[PDB]
Amino acid sequence: SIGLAHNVTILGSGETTVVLGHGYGTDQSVWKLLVPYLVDDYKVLLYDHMGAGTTNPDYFDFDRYSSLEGYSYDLIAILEEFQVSKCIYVGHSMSSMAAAVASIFRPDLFHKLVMISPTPRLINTEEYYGGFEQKVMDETLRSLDENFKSLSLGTAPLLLACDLESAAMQEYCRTLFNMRPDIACCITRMICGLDLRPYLGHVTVPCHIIQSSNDIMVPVAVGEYLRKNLGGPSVVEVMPTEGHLPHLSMPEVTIPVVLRHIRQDITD
């Protein structure tokens, strides 16, 4: 079963299903503080994307997961297996973009997308600022495999905007280093090379874009870029948070914002 392969869990009850999709380096446990505020009002489906440390390495196809589309098509299959349609999809960066692509092919499966720290592309061009320069990225990725742990540990405090000794950091590193090393490196290279800009004008489901005010992975202007380039309606809310995973590191601020966007539609 694809649901079993993705450790799908179902909780709550209701006519509307919320689907929670964790981002890079985490698993569905990242949602543990949000779930209590959903369980009374919604059915909730949680899953781990393929290659998370909780998943079977034998199911990781290095060809399919070298681009984001494979994750999009897996998500469709998960939703179909559990008879989910018109869901409220809540995702962190990588996952929210995979759902956006999925929604082009199956808009019937999505009522809206709630996106925490999304970006369609990290690498700068002459006309687009994603935060990272190609030639520096090239140097860093050349020695990624032998340096995965040291580079990840070295950058995580700025990535998360948390101290190395903090509880949020310990939680992130626990799941990050649970991935098998070759799988982690494949997913990392996939993320660093993504360019989903060609898809944006064909996304038409409503998108709720939730960003930290200071996120080393997401220049603040990327949210407005998404609003201007998505094909349907969207709302952009920059939060008084720092870090790329504000749902993990600053839940006291982030959870009420996520809940508002789950509960309140921007279309009729």
Side-chain angles (χ1 to χ4, degrees), residues 1 59 78 92 95 107 111 175 187 189 192 199 210 222 240:
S1 158
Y59 303 154
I78 293 162
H92 177 254
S95 187
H111 179 60
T175 53
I187 297 175
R189 289 190 164 97
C192 287
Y199 288 114
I210 298 170
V222 168

PDB file of all heavy atoms in Angstrom, residues 1 59 78 92 95 107 111 175 187 189 192 199 210 222 240:
ATOM      1  N   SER A   1       0.835  -1.191   0.000  1.00  0.00           N
ATOM      2  CA  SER A   1       0.000   0.000   0.000  1.00  0.00           C
ATOM      3  C   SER A   1       0.874   1.248   0.000  1.00  0.00           C
ATOM      4  O   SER A   1       1.850   1.337   0.747  1.00  0.00           O
ATOM      5  CB  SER A   1      -0.932  -0.001   1.221  1.00  0.00           C
ATOM      6  OG  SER A   1      -1.380   1.307   1.543  1.00  0.00           O
ATOM      7  N   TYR A  59      12.221   1.757  -1.140  1.00  0.00           N
ATOM      8  CA  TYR A  59      11.212   2.413  -1.958  1.00  0.00           C
ATOM      9  C   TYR A  59      11.699   3.728  -2.547  1.00  0.00           C
ATOM     10  O   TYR A  59      10.956   4.361  -3.306  1.00  0.00           O
ATOM     11  CB  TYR A  59       9.938   2.674  -1.141  1.00  0.00           C
ATOM     12  CG  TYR A  59       9.312   1.445  -0.505  1.00  0.00           C
ATOM     13  CD1 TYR A  59       8.530   1.560   0.638  1.00  0.00           C
ATOM     14  CD2 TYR A  59       9.497   0.180  -1.045  1.00  0.00           C
ATOM     15  CE1 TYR A  59       7.951   0.455   1.227  1.00  0.00           C
ATOM     16  CE2 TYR A  59       8.922  -0.939  -0.461  1.00  0.00           C
ATOM     17  CZ  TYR A  59       8.149  -0.792   0.676  1.00  0.00           C
ATOM     18  OH  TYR A  59       7.573  -1.893   1.265  1.00  0.00           O
ATOM     19  N   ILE A  78      -1.622   9.011  -2.807  1.00  0.00           N
ATOM     20  CA  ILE A  78      -1.994   8.920  -1.396  1.00  0.00           C
ATOM     21  C   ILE A  78      -3.414   9.431  -1.185  1.00  0.00           C
ATOM     22  O   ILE A  78      -4.230   8.786  -0.513  1.00  0.00           O
ATOM     23  CB  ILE A  78      -0.981   9.679  -0.518  1.00  0.00           C
ATOM     24  CG1 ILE A  78       0.388   8.993  -0.558  1.00  0.00           C
ATOM     25  CG2 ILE A  78      -1.494   9.781   0.925  1.00  0.00           C
ATOM     26  CD1 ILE A  78       1.541   9.883  -0.102  1.00  0.00           C
ATOM     27  N   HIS A  92       4.932  22.534   4.356  1.00  0.00           N
ATOM     28  CA  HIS A  92       6.120  23.352   4.508  1.00  0.00           C
ATOM     29  C   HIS A  92       6.963  23.252   3.245  1.00  0.00           C
ATOM     30  O   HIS A  92       7.135  22.163   2.691  1.00  0.00           O
ATOM     31  CB  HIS A  92       6.946  22.876   5.698  1.00  0.00           C
ATOM     32  CG  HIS A  92       8.224  23.631   5.861  1.00  0.00           C
ATOM     33  ND1 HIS A  92       9.455  23.094   5.553  1.00  0.00           N
ATOM     34  CD2 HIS A  92       8.455  24.907   6.244  1.00  0.00           C
ATOM     35  CE1 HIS A  92      10.394  23.999   5.768  1.00  0.00           C
ATOM     36  NE2 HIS A  92       9.814  25.106   6.193  1.00  0.00           N
ATOM     37  N   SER A  95       7.062  20.593   0.369  1.00  0.00           N
ATOM     38  CA  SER A  95       5.806  19.859   0.285  1.00  0.00           C
ATOM     39  C   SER A  95       4.695  20.726  -0.290  1.00  0.00           C
ATOM     40  O   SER A  95       3.888  20.251  -1.096  1.00  0.00           O
ATOM     41  CB  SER A  95       5.427  19.357   1.675  1.00  0.00           C
ATOM     42  OG  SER A  95       4.300  18.513   1.619  1.00  0.00           O
ATOM     43  N   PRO A 107      -6.934  19.424  -9.673  1.00  0.00           N
ATOM     44  CA  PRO A 107      -7.515  20.486  -8.834  1.00  0.00           C
ATOM     45  C   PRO A 107      -8.711  20.014  -8.034  1.00  0.00           C
ATOM     46  O   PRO A 107      -9.054  20.640  -7.017  1.00  0.00           O
ATOM     47  CB  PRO A 107      -7.893  21.582  -9.843  1.00  0.00           C
ATOM     48  CG  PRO A 107      -8.056  20.842 -11.152  1.00  0.00           C
ATOM     49  CD  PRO A 107      -7.061  19.715 -11.114  1.00  0.00           C
ATOM     50  N   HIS A 111      -8.968  21.924  -2.029  1.00  0.00           N
ATOM     51  CA  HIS A 111      -9.795  23.103  -1.793  1.00  0.00           C
ATOM     52  C   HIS A 111      -8.934  24.354  -1.669  1.00  0.00           C
ATOM     53  O   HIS A 111      -9.302  25.424  -2.174  1.00  0.00           O
ATOM     54  CB  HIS A 111     -10.607  22.896  -0.513  1.00  0.00           C
ATOM     55  CG  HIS A 111     -11.473  24.059  -0.143  1.00  0.00           C
ATOM     56  ND1 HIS A 111     -12.474  24.533  -0.965  1.00  0.00           N
ATOM     57  CD2 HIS A 111     -11.489  24.845   0.961  1.00  0.00           C
ATOM     58  CE1 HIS A 111     -13.070  25.559  -0.381  1.00  0.00           C
ATOM     59  NE2 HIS A 111     -12.494  25.766   0.789  1.00  0.00           N
ATOM     60  N   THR A 175      15.469  14.218  13.108  1.00  0.00           N
ATOM     61  CA  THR A 175      14.860  13.705  11.887  1.00  0.00           C
ATOM     62  C   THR A 175      15.777  13.882  10.680  1.00  0.00           C
ATOM     63  O   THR A 175      15.825  13.010   9.806  1.00  0.00           O
ATOM     64  CB  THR A 175      13.493  14.358  11.659  1.00  0.00           C
ATOM     65  OG1 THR A 175      13.617  15.784  11.712  1.00  0.00           O
ATOM     66  CG2 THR A 175      12.500  13.905  12.723  1.00  0.00           C
ATOM     67  N   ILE A 187      17.930  14.171  -2.166  1.00  0.00           N
ATOM     68  CA  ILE A 187      16.869  15.142  -1.919  1.00  0.00           C
ATOM     69  C   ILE A 187      17.436  16.555  -1.853  1.00  0.00           C
ATOM     70  O   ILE A 187      16.856  17.498  -2.400  1.00  0.00           O
ATOM     71  CB  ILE A 187      16.098  14.768  -0.642  1.00  0.00           C
ATOM     72  CG1 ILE A 187      15.405  13.419  -0.832  1.00  0.00           C
ATOM     73  CG2 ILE A 187      15.091  15.841  -0.306  1.00  0.00           C
ATOM     74  CD1 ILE A 187      14.716  12.916   0.423  1.00  0.00           C
ATOM     75  N   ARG A 189      20.168  17.799  -3.312  1.00  0.00           N
ATOM     76  CA  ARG A 189      20.495  18.275  -4.650  1.00  0.00           C
ATOM     77  C   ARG A 189      19.234  18.601  -5.444  1.00  0.00           C
ATOM     78  O   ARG A 189      19.202  19.587  -6.195  1.00  0.00           O
ATOM     79  CB  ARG A 189      21.357  17.240  -5.373  1.00  0.00           C
ATOM     80  CG  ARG A 189      22.769  17.145  -4.796  1.00  0.00           C
ATOM     81  CD  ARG A 189      23.679  16.299  -5.677  1.00  0.00           C
ATOM     82  NE  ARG A 189      25.086  16.509  -5.348  1.00  0.00           N
ATOM     83  CZ  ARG A 189      25.782  15.719  -4.544  1.00  0.00           C
ATOM     84  NH1 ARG A 189      25.199  14.656  -4.004  1.00  0.00           N
ATOM     85  NH2 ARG A 189      27.060  15.979  -4.286  1.00  0.00           N
ATOM     86  N   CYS A 192      17.937  22.017  -4.239  1.00  0.00           N
ATOM     87  CA  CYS A 192      18.800  23.130  -4.609  1.00  0.00           C
ATOM     88  C   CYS A 192      18.653  23.488  -6.081  1.00  0.00           C
ATOM     89  O   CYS A 192      18.850  24.649  -6.454  1.00  0.00           O
ATOM     90  CB  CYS A 192      20.251  22.772  -4.282  1.00  0.00           C
ATOM     91  SG  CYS A 192      20.604  22.809  -2.487  1.00  0.00           S
ATOM     92  N   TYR A 199       5.427  26.495 -13.600  1.00  0.00           N
ATOM     93  CA  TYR A 199       4.135  25.959 -13.199  1.00  0.00           C
ATOM     94  C   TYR A 199       3.200  27.007 -12.604  1.00  0.00           C
ATOM     95  O   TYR A 199       1.988  26.781 -12.588  1.00  0.00           O
ATOM     96  CB  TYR A 199       4.337  24.875 -12.137  1.00  0.00           C
ATOM     97  CG  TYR A 199       4.914  23.565 -12.621  1.00  0.00           C
ATOM     98  CD1 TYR A 199       6.174  23.142 -12.205  1.00  0.00           C
ATOM     99  CD2 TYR A 199       4.176  22.719 -13.448  1.00  0.00           C
ATOM    100  CE1 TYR A 199       6.694  21.924 -12.616  1.00  0.00           C
ATOM    101  CE2 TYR A 199       4.685  21.500 -13.864  1.00  0.00           C
ATOM    102  CZ  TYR A 199       5.944  21.108 -13.442  1.00  0.00           C
ATOM    103  OH  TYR A 199       6.448  19.891 -13.852  1.00  0.00           O
ATOM    104  N   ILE A 210       2.429  31.794   3.797  1.00  0.00           N
ATOM    105  CA  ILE A 210       2.830  32.180   5.150  1.00  0.00           C
ATOM    106  C   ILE A 210       4.355  32.161   5.209  1.00  0.00           C
ATOM    107  O   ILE A 210       4.971  31.117   4.974  1.00  0.00           O
ATOM    108  CB  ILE A 210       2.240  31.211   6.187  1.00  0.00           C
ATOM    109  CG1 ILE A 210       0.709  31.249   6.141  1.00  0.00           C
ATOM    110  CG2 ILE A 210       2.799  31.500   7.581  1.00  0.00           C
ATOM    111  CD1 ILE A 210       0.056  30.147   6.973  1.00  0.00           C
ATOM    112  N   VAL A 222       9.826  36.975  -2.275  1.00  0.00           N
ATOM    113  CA  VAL A 222       9.341  35.775  -2.958  1.00  0.00           C
ATOM    114  C   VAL A 222       7.843  35.589  -2.740  1.00  0.00           C
ATOM    115  O   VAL A 222       7.128  35.121  -3.637  1.00  0.00           O
ATOM    116  CB  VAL A 222      10.171  34.537  -2.552  1.00  0.00           C
ATOM    117  CG1 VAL A 222       9.503  33.243  -3.008  1.00  0.00           C
ATOM    118  CG2 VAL A 222      11.578  34.631  -3.122  1.00  0.00           C
ATOM    119  N   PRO A 240       5.910  37.871  12.193  1.00  0.00           N
ATOM    120  CA  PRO A 240       7.053  38.360  12.983  1.00  0.00           C
ATOM    121  C   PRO A 240       7.863  37.203  13.558  1.00  0.00           C
ATOM    122  O   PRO A 240       8.034  37.055  14.772  1.00  0.00           O
ATOM    123  CB  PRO A 240       6.362  39.194  14.067  1.00  0.00           C
ATOM    124  CG  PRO A 240       5.072  38.485  14.290  1.00  0.00           C
ATOM    125  CD  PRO A 240       4.637  38.002  12.927  1.00  0.00           C
TER     126      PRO A 240
END
